[PDB]
Design a protein around this motif. Structure first.
Motif, PDB file in Angstrom:
ATOM      1  N   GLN A   1     -36.463   4.159   3.237  1.00  0.00           N
ATOM      2  CA  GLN A   1     -36.897   2.779   3.377  1.00  0.00           C
ATOM      3  C   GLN A   1     -35.842   2.006   4.146  1.00  0.00           C
ATOM      4  O   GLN A   1     -34.665   2.001   3.758  1.00  0.00           O
ATOM      5  CB  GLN A   1     -37.152   2.152   2.018  1.00  0.00           C
ATOM      6  CG  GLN A   1     -37.611   0.731   2.118  1.00  0.00           C
ATOM      7  CD  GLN A   1     -38.072   0.203   0.773  1.00  0.00           C
ATOM      8  OE1 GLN A   1     -38.660   0.939  -0.024  1.00  0.00           O
ATOM      9  NE2 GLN A   1     -37.798  -1.071   0.508  1.00  0.00           N
TER      10      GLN A   1
ATOM     11  N   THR B   1     -49.728 -13.333   7.588  1.00  0.00           N
ATOM     12  CA  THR B   1     -48.381 -13.164   7.061  1.00  0.00           C
ATOM     13  C   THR B   1     -47.684 -11.892   7.519  1.00  0.00           C
ATOM     14  O   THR B   1     -46.449 -11.837   7.463  1.00  0.00           O
ATOM     15  CB  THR B   1     -48.409 -13.182   5.533  1.00  0.00           C
ATOM     16  OG1 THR B   1     -49.330 -12.194   5.072  1.00  0.00           O
ATOM     17  CG2 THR B   1     -48.847 -14.541   5.028  1.00  0.00           C
ATOM     18  N   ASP B   2     -48.435 -10.881   7.965  1.00  0.00           N
ATOM     19  CA  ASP B   2     -47.884  -9.590   8.355  1.00  0.00           C
ATOM     20  C   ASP B   2     -48.669  -9.058   9.546  1.00  0.00           C
ATOM     21  O   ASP B   2     -49.878  -9.290   9.657  1.00  0.00           O
ATOM     22  CB  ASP B   2     -47.972  -8.537   7.226  1.00  0.00           C
ATOM     23  CG  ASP B   2     -47.672  -9.106   5.838  1.00  0.00           C
ATOM     24  OD1 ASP B   2     -48.636  -9.473   5.112  1.00  0.00           O
ATOM     25  OD2 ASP B   2     -46.480  -9.128   5.453  1.00  0.00           O
TER      26      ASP B   2
ATOM     27  N   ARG C   1     -48.640  -5.229  12.235  1.00  0.00           N
ATOM     28  CA  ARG C   1     -48.158  -3.872  12.428  1.00  0.00           C
ATOM     29  C   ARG C   1     -47.858  -3.630  13.894  1.00  0.00           C
ATOM     30  O   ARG C   1     -48.549  -4.143  14.775  1.00  0.00           O
ATOM     31  CB  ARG C   1     -49.178  -2.842  11.954  1.00  0.00           C
ATOM     32  CG  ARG C   1     -49.177  -2.628  10.466  1.00  0.00           C
ATOM     33  CD  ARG C   1     -49.799  -3.811   9.713  1.00  0.00           C
ATOM     34  NE  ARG C   1     -49.692  -3.593   8.275  1.00  0.00           N
ATOM     35  CZ  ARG C   1     -50.121  -4.434   7.349  1.00  0.00           C
ATOM     36  NH1 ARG C   1     -50.706  -5.578   7.708  1.00  0.00           N
ATOM     37  NH2 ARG C   1     -49.978  -4.121   6.060  1.00  0.00           N
TER      38      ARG C   1
ATOM     39  N   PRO D   1     -46.835   8.063  10.100  1.00  0.00           N
ATOM     40  CA  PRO D   1     -46.987   7.380  11.395  1.00  0.00           C
ATOM     41  C   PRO D   1     -45.806   6.466  11.705  1.00  0.00           C
ATOM     42  O   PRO D   1     -45.291   5.769  10.831  1.00  0.00           O
ATOM     43  CB  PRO D   1     -48.275   6.568  11.214  1.00  0.00           C
ATOM     44  CG  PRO D   1     -48.979   7.184  10.042  1.00  0.00           C
ATOM     45  CD  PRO D   1     -47.896   7.679   9.150  1.00  0.00           C
TER      46      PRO D   1
ATOM     47  N   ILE E   1     -45.034   3.546  12.653  1.00  0.00           N
ATOM     48  CA  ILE E   1     -45.495   2.167  12.695  1.00  0.00           C
ATOM     49  C   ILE E   1     -44.652   1.353  11.725  1.00  0.00           C
ATOM     50  O   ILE E   1     -44.458   1.764  10.576  1.00  0.00           O
ATOM     51  CB  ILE E   1     -46.986   2.079  12.333  1.00  0.00           C
ATOM     52  CG1 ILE E   1     -47.800   2.979  13.277  1.00  0.00           C
ATOM     53  CG2 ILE E   1     -47.451   0.609  12.311  1.00  0.00           C
ATOM     54  CD1 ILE E   1     -49.246   3.178  12.868  1.00  0.00           C
TER      55      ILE E   1
ATOM     56  N   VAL F   1     -43.804  -2.655   9.942  1.00  0.00           N
ATOM     57  CA  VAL F   1     -44.501  -3.854   9.479  1.00  0.00           C
ATOM     58  C   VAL F   1     -43.566  -5.055   9.594  1.00  0.00           C
ATOM     59  O   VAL F   1     -42.421  -5.007   9.131  1.00  0.00           O
ATOM     60  CB  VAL F   1     -45.011  -3.691   8.036  1.00  0.00           C
ATOM     61  CG1 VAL F   1     -45.579  -5.027   7.491  1.00  0.00           C
ATOM     62  CG2 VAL F   1     -46.063  -2.599   7.991  1.00  0.00           C
TER      63      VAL F   1
ATOM     64  N   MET G   1     -40.045  -3.921   8.001  1.00  0.00           N
ATOM     65  CA  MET G   1     -39.960  -2.784   7.099  1.00  0.00           C
ATOM     66  C   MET G   1     -40.493  -1.547   7.815  1.00  0.00           C
ATOM     67  O   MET G   1     -41.629  -1.543   8.298  1.00  0.00           O
ATOM     68  CB  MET G   1     -40.717  -3.064   5.801  1.00  0.00           C
ATOM     69  CG  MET G   1     -40.264  -2.182   4.646  1.00  0.00           C
ATOM     70  SD  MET G   1     -40.860  -2.738   3.020  1.00  0.00           S
ATOM     71  CE  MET G   1     -39.786  -4.136   2.689  1.00  0.00           C
TER      72      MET G   1
ATOM     73  N   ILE H   1     -40.544   2.697   7.106  1.00  0.00           N
ATOM     74  CA  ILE H   1     -40.280   3.643   6.019  1.00  0.00           C
ATOM     75  C   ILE H   1     -40.803   5.029   6.378  1.00  0.00           C
ATOM     76  O   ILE H   1     -41.863   5.439   5.871  1.00  0.00           O
ATOM     77  CB  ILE H   1     -40.910   3.179   4.697  1.00  0.00           C
ATOM     78  CG1 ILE H   1     -40.611   1.707   4.414  1.00  0.00           C
ATOM     79  CG2 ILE H   1     -40.366   4.005   3.571  1.00  0.00           C
ATOM     80  CD1 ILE H   1     -41.253   1.201   3.136  1.00  0.00           C
TER      81      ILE H   1
END
Ligand SMILES: CN(C)CCOc1cncc(N2C[C@@H]3CNC[C@@H](C3)C2)c1
Ligand SMILES: CN(C)CCOc1cncc(N2C[C@@H]3CNC[C@@H](C3)C2)c1
Ligand SMILES: CN(C)CCOc1cncc(N2C[C@@H]3CNC[C@@H](C3)C2)c1
Ligand SMILES: CN(C)CCOc1cncc(N2C[C@@H]3CNC[C@@H](C3)C2)c1
Lengths: 211, 204, 202, 207, 212
Positions: free
Chosen positions: D57, D76-77, D79, D104, D106, D108, D116, D118
């Motif tokens: 993470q 709010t988020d 990708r 994947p 990708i 966030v 983030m 991970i």
């Protein structure tokens, strides 16, 4: 010398005419379907694993189709009648083995041959791991396995799949393989799958072999 | 400083050839240096070779007068920026693995030199490798899609360079040859050409 | 804010064709041996994990930090600058990179590139189960640049063993790195390599 | 209908935001690092390699990735492919094979500018498994840090010194007796600067 | 037949027009969530390794979703009802296996089929090593293993995951496999992870199997 470059110029003009001064073939459709011919040349059965029921085959996959948008008159281009092009630069059929257990490994350059009648020939050599139970391989009757090849995303109404010939080409088979081929056939079939209404076409390769 | 600008100008002049044809065929010279027989597998009849494959050809469209470019006589270029022959082993059982950078050297006369080091796995029955006479295996190299009328193969010698061969390999080389041969199929009218690498070897 | 703009400015101003006989380049090489992972007496391949420190300086990467918010170093993808084509001359598999492919450029124009790698190479391990152990060698150098274009140097002849894995199956008795010039049959020009000589035992 | 407006707000956001070169000594960055250990697949005592599957993470925060959700339909988020943004070069320092990526690539991004990423990964690293068939088990370690950025450009911290063991495969061949992750600061012989890493220490034994 | 020829010419032109129109959707959001339908066809259990507790599967993973931005009227496009596109040219869900021990290996061309109503069908064939204890496989009741699939970075409020049957399709299962399938089910679950507050959703593939 000067003739030599006129020859290079003719071929550049032909590729530039075909690939830039006309739209590129976007693939077949129900209204404009494409006949794809398929042939197999078996080179070597490398390995038969009775603990996983996988068998590894080296073979050449002969693919032929013919496109109006790749026709030309040799008289307009220095009497050139063929040229080579990277397979990535043109449309190619998505022939897929339906029971491979590993991604297919490519052993030869990915290059197609285009002839002035618009026919394309593409012959990749590959190593394929597929589902096969080798029980019987150490007997006179040998073992019998099969793997079929066809489009993954085109129905039989879009790609009309045919074999070049009834007989698998065994003339280049490795004489000193651990396995002799007793026989091999290649046969077109039609099949429906649960996901989908449309009918699909594959060529089934059946091989009898033994130690 | 002026040297660097001359090299860049030269690359631009050259870079800003569509392959050989029947009317403009290309001669590609092949030579092998055998570095090691790593492994011979009698359960699958595959043998693994490490070698250097020397390739040489010469193109008018790559020639330049050094006088017009700071007296520059060679430059380096990624193999992906120039045409290169599609020489392939005809009986490999795994994709060939590249052991050296994919860079060619271009010299002012238009000659190109390209020497990939490779590990090859290919079809070979190693029976007899533990005897005095050893085993004998063979693998052909040549273009995958060009005929002997477009790509003319030749060698400088039938003797494989063994001067670099790994002295503590499991297997010693008794002989290694590289022979050009011209073949005609009756299927087809054109000549075809390959270089046959024949290696006789046995356990040390 | 102003520094991010300076850094972006520096990189845009800077963004060399490689060395030539008129403009030759000195490259400095050093090895930090991390681990002898495996010795295979059935094929005579041995596997090393090592760090390969490469260093060179270029005038076209020099800058004055006061013209750029006092920035003295930056990071770039190794694909975005010329890097030397240092090759193991006796590998038996393609070398496997273990670290990010990023270089550090310093305002004097020096570049530092340190790939961590796993290498399989031709090496006979007989003797490894004795007090004197086995000895193997692998040499490193440009594949396509002669010693007249790339001048290969070391800072020392001793391999850095200070990070060697203390619980490896093999202990390092000695490890040396030495520059040498080589003639080959193909080519009139001389080449330069660093030969890594390692004596090791179980 | 409103869903099409929501897609437009997202595209506007991604377009606006994408009109950062990484950290420097004058604009450093603290990356939060934690490990979710999934499985010890294999311990090899003939080469002293051990194979882990874990989640790594990674979390950092950039002002240039902040936005007001009120301006963009309360989004709010979003990708983004990890190739289209800067990501830290966290590296294991004693792996013996290239790390294998299982999830994947990708990341966030949240409106407060936090990122983030991970990746699930399979790692082979240097580990002597001697003792793993005893009650005490074996102890091994592998540390993670930037390869090319010093502590003053990328610093690390952990939220906890305990490794997350809540996703550990309950039928693994190996059970975890303890797993800690601890930040350290270290110098190397090549370089004047101070590097930072999180050392992961794992005591394990046969099930 | 001259008519037949340029009928074909116009078909290609219609297909390129339709693709040009459509290509000349940025993913789901909390306000605009996307429902993805997920289903598996199991082709083969290739290998069960009791020394590492890894098992290898070959399966087809059927993914289906529908977008208004991919709809068209065939009447306007020469009656074309489908087209193929590289899966890299369109958004696709990041459906991931949660307990793989090796990168999943794709076996089919990475191509999606788009239909005039806006639904997309993508069916990658895959080979997968996942965490699995094969204890029991040499017994009448066999072994039982499970691997779950779902988005890696999207919550269940962005990607709504759904099956349209609980049964794994076994009609193509390799009849000469080393292992026979006793049962295979696919079941959606929700779950929270320590890292994050949002809830994630996946489909759990439970397979009971034994030596043939
Ligand atoms: C319903 N429709 C017109 C969309 C068809 O989209 C597809 C996309 N990818 C793969 C498939 N197939 C998967 C199996 C392997 N290939 C042959 C069958 C069965 C079709 C179908
Ligand atoms: C002759 N000339 C001015 C062009 C040299 O072109 C070359 C291109 N690629 C590789 C090499 N070499 C291969 C071996 C390994 N590297 C050191 C030697 C021997 C050089 C040479
Ligand atoms: C002096 N300077 C600003 C140049 C630093 O540039 C570097 C480039 N590549 C790698 C490293 N390192 C590799 C080892 C692993 N990481 C920590 C140490 C040791 C640094 C350093
Ligand atoms: C908190 N937030 C809005 C940012 C979440 O960003 C993420 C980015 N990449 C991966 C994950 N995850 C990794 C594990 C696998 N997937 C399910 C969980 C656990 C989520 C989360």
């Amino acid at each position: 010398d000067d003739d030599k470059l006129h020859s290079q110029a003719n071929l550049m003009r032909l590729k530039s005419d075909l690939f830039n001064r006309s739209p590129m073939y976007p693939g077949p459709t129900k209204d404009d379907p494409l006949t794809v011919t398929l042939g197999f040349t078996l080179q070597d059965i490398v390995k038969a694993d009775s603990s996983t029921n996988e068998v590894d085959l080296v073979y050449w996959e002969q693919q032929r189709w013919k496109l109006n948008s790749l026709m030309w008159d040799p008289n307009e281009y220095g009497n050139i009648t063929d040229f080579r092009t990277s397979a990535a630069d043109i449309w190619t059929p998505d022939i897929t083995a339906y029971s491979s257990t590993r991604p297919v490994q490519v052993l030869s350059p990915q290059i197609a041959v285009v002839t002035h009648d618009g026919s394309v020939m593409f012959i990749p050599a590959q190593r394929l791991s597929f589902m096969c139970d080798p029980t019987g391989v150490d007997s006179e009757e040998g073992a019998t396995c099969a793997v079929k090849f066809g489009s993954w995303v085109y129905s039989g109404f879009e790609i009309d799949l045919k074999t070049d010939t009834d007989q698998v080409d065994l003339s280049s088979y490795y004489a000193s393989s651990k396995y002799e081929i007793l026989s091999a056939t290649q046969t077109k079939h039609d099949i429906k799958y649960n996901c989908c209404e449309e009918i699909y076409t594959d060529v089934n390769l059946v091989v009898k072999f033994r130690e």
